[PDB]
């Protein structure tokens, strides 16, 4: 019986109080409305209808901290209300036109969004907790602020990232996490280590999995090429190694990403999202900002996008659900006792691929009654026979290594990260600065360590923004240690408020 472990990793860097658009609080509001709330509704249905098709969901600590924030909750409420009004306005403008059906859908969507958000008391974290409680999903944690594990300069800093993540998970769910999502699936085994830039001490460092083990984590995930060598997914076939559960020397277990299921969904040439009926991500209404057009054709110009047909688009998800399950059955036939790990960035479903969440639900419903492929949580997925394996260093990023986050444009970044991590450690040992100052400084360090900054600069999704973002957290960090006034500290505490119980002791041992 082949095991299918669907793993969704929900994440977004800290945008609370740092602007709204392009990349700001609105980015978080969109995800809540298009990905998280719809996902919660799927979970509620499956529980209500007794459908047994569990999967795994990761919510990075920094994301959960924002979702549970009063300002974000109120901000989302205003966002949704405003969107509903924009939808109602579009329905009157487009009534009787080719965009009517799409306009009606928008109204219905936002009405449901406001009503659902209101019925959950605007607390998404609580709903996910409820779903896990029902057994419909397993929740896993990650690095506090999604720091790039392999490159953090100090073991105590990586420890702080990991431990703060476990603590946040406990705080929000009143349970301990056994599963852990490695940001960018970036891994580094035990062994000699030399800093990429000046700062950190060069010497033997424990493997990332060793710290995870010490933190109570029992399993994580890595990209396919870490267990089967060869080319990364930057055609990459799935060797038998990728279908086995792997146990490291530390005792930690790892599953490897299945290439086929990843490409079948993400591919720009044949991924499901490219289907012509699906809603076009890149075309927004000049006046309302809403999406009323469909992909139509992958090559098609924006001006050539045809009107969006909501009904036809969502109906199409059933077809792709069957197709996907067909692929799972072939993979299963090839490895009847293997484990198929299909890990994705959660925002892919709902935000990038609008109909993607309905697709997920369709897939789970089909898998609940599938004799060849059994949907399981990560914990169940890692049980049974395992291959003793040693993992080389790498990630699931372009090139299968660290080039995306470590490069020409990000040298200054890691430079400041290393300096800051060392200072944090020292400040923690000295213990002379006020408790509050140490906690906020720690917060600034964590925010600075977000891999999202170097990522957004290399990709070009928001280079100037990301650059200013890390420079400011760095600036705030050293200013706090060098000496800031009580009111300057409070302004930073209010602006950057994640981790109310951040523990500076973590930088010691």
List keywords for this structure.
immunoglobulin/albumin-binding domain-like, unknown function, structural genomics, unknown function, six-stranded parallel beta sheet, monomeric, rsgi, alpha/beta, 7-stranded beta/alpha barrel
Q: Can you lay out the helices and strands and say which pair or pack?
A:
Elements: E1 2-10, H1 25-48, E2 55-59, H2 61-67, H3 70-94, H4 100-119, H5 124-134, E3 137-142, H6 155-173, E4 180-181, E5 191-193, E6 203-205, H7 208-214, E7 219-222, H8 225-228, E8 246-247, E9 253-256, H9 259-266, E10 293-294, E11 306-307, H10 310-334, E12 339-345, H11 356-368, E13 373-375, H12 378-381, E14 387-388, H13 411-430, H14 435-448, H15 452-459, H16 463-483, H17 486-495
Parallel strand pairs: 1-2, 1-12, 1-13, 2-3, 3-4, 7-9, 8-14
Antiparallel strand pairs: 5-6, 8-9, 10-11
Helix pairs in contact: 1-3, 1-5, 1-11, 2-6, 3-4, 10-11, 13-14, 13-16, 14-16, 15-16
Catalytic activity: Transfers a segment of a (1->4)-alpha-D-glucan chain to a primary hydroxy group in a similar glucan chain
Binding site for substrate: 257, 274, 396, 452, 461
GO molecular function: 1,4-alpha-glucan branching enzyme activity
């Amino acid at each position: 019986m082949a095991r299918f472990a669907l793993v969704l990793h929900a994440h977004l860097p800290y945008v609370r109080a740092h602007g709204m658009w392009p990349f700001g609080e609105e980015t978080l509001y969109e995800a809540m409305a298009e990905t998280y709330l719809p996902l919660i509704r799927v979970l509620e249905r499956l529980r209500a209808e007794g459908v047994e098709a569990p999967f795994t969901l990761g919510i990075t600590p920094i994301l959960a901290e924002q979702l549970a924030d009063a300002r974000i909750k109120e901000g989302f409420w205003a966002y949704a209300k405003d969107r509903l009004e924009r939808a109602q306005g579009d329905y009157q403008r487009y009534r009787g036109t080719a965009l009517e059906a799409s306009a009606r859908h928008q109204v219905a969507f936002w009405e449901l969004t406001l009503d659902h958000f209101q019925r959950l008391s605007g607390d998404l974290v609580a709903a996910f907790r409820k779903a896990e409680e029902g057994g419909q999903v397993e929740l896993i944690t990650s690095n506090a602020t999604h720091g790039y594990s392999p490159l953090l300069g100090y073991d105590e800093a990586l420890w702080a990232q990991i431990k703060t993540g476990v603590s946040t998970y406990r705080r929000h769910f009143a349970k301990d996490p056994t599963g852990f999502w490695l940001p960018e699936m970036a891994y580094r085994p035990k062994g000699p280590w030399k800093p990429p830039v000046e700062g950190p001490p060069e010497g033997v460092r424990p493997g990332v999995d060793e710290l995870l083990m010490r933190a109570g984590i029992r399993y994580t995930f890595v990209d396919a090429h870490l267990v089967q060598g060869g080319e990364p997914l930057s055609p990459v076939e799935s060797q038998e190694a990728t279908y086995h559960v792997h146990e490291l020397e530390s005792g930690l277990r790892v599953l490897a990403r299945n290439p086929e299921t990843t490409l079948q969904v993400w591919s720009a040439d044949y991924g499901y999202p490219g289907e012509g009926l699906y809603r076009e991500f890149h075309r927004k209404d000049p006046l309302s900002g809403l999406h009323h057009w469909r992909v139509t054709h992958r090559k098609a110009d924006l001006a050539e996008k045809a009107p969006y047909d909501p009904e036809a688009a969502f109906a199409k998800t059933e077809e792709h659900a069957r197709h996907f399950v067909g692929l799972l059955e072939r993979l299963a036939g090839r490895h009847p006792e293997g484990v198929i790990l299909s890990p994705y960035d959660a925002e892919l479903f709902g935000h990038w691929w609008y109909e993607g969440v309905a697709w997920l639900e369709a897939v789970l419903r089909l898998l609940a009654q599938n004799p060849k492929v059994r949907p399981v949580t990560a914990r169940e997925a890692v049980q049974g026979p395992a291959v003793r394996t040693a993992l080389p260093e790498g990630s699931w990023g372009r090139g299968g290594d660290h080039r995306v986050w470590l490069n020409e444009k990000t040298l200054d970044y890691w430079e400041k990260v290393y300096r800051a991590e060392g200072a944090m450690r020292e400040a923690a040992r000295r213990g002379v600065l006020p408790e509050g100052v140490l906690r906020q400084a720690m917060r600034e360090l964590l925010l600075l360590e977000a891999s999202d900054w170097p990522f957004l600069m290399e990709t070009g999704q928001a280079e100037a923004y990301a650059r200013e973002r890390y420079e400011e957290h760095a600036r705030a960090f050293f200013h706090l240690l060098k000496g800031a006034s009580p009111e300057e500290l409070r302004a930073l505490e209010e602006r950057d408020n994640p981790f109310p119980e951040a523990d500076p002791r973590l930088y010691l041992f």
